Amino acid sequence: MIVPVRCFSCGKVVGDKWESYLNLLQEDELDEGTALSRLGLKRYCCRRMILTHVDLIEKFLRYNPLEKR
């Protein structure tokens, strides 16, 4: 749902490297390899955290029963 922080295996903070990762993919048009190495994720434990996150929060928010459609 939401980007995780404090990767389970290693413990390094990862929640602050999701929007900057989407910027490195959309703006610079880099590959997944270099876009992960630029953020400073050397170990494959914390690499797979945002390399594989689904981020369903962008689709959960589309249901707002508190304001008109």
Binding site: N64, P65, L66, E67, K68
Partner: protein, 43 residues
């Protein structure tokens, strides 16, 4: 208080009042959350 199911209008009813929204012709009502204190664990 309460909000509608499709129009999402801030409304409220009293005793001997029809359970429906005044803006549209619907019957489902959602009860909003009020500002009160609750203590949970930060784990």
């Amino acid at each position: 208080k309460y909000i509608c199911a499709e129009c999402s209008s801030k409304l409220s009813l009293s005793r001997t009042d029809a359970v429906r929204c005044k803006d549209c012709g619907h019957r489902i009502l959602l009860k909003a959350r009020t500002k009160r204190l609750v203590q949970f664990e930060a784990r």
